[PDB]
Amino acid sequence: AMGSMERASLIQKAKLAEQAERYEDMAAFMKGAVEKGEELSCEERNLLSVAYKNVVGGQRAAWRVLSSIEQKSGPEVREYREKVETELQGVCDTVLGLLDSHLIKEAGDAESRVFYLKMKGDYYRYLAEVATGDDKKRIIDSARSAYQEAMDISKKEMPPTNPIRLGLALNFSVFHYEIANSPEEAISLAKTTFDEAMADLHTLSEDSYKDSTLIMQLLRDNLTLWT
């Protein structure tokens, strides 16, 4: 639908849609921007992630409410849970398709490549939340593979306080705890990530320190929930 709109106009409209809390419109604008075929700047990668995370967030919350009602229990609750689930899978497939065509292959700098591989892990993780049986096993391994590739690049190329490296580690730990039935791996990764970041905070400016400590606090909040 966005092929006739200028790239810069799509980006400006994405920012307006964000201000208006119109996240579906924000995601359509950012999909159109990606489909222009150019690489995304830092700010543009943030807009893409904000848009899709808010869309799939509403779907994830609705699916949890419907699955709870269905578990408590005619065909209508299952049919409607299935409708929401299919829409959620379609959003995840759309994001994964943008990453595969062609954001990841063109991302050479660590900050872009790690961010996109983290996103790949995250959207396979959202697919895994609603998957059953053998479908779930393959989707879990796809998430795990993307997170591991991102982790290996982040540990080689980024300091331990880097917010992207922290946010990756924080989501990989969620994957281990919530998806992979590996709570011990989740706790170990959160603890090591936290402690290595703590030891590198002395290198940061006031503003960088605030960026890093905000993600570190999420690691600590999870360790408090998990232990």
Binding site: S49, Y177, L225
Partner: peptide, 13 residues
Amino acid sequence: RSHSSPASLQLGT
């Protein structure tokens, strides 16, 4: 129940 990352990981570049 677990907390995952915000969509934006830091304020700037």
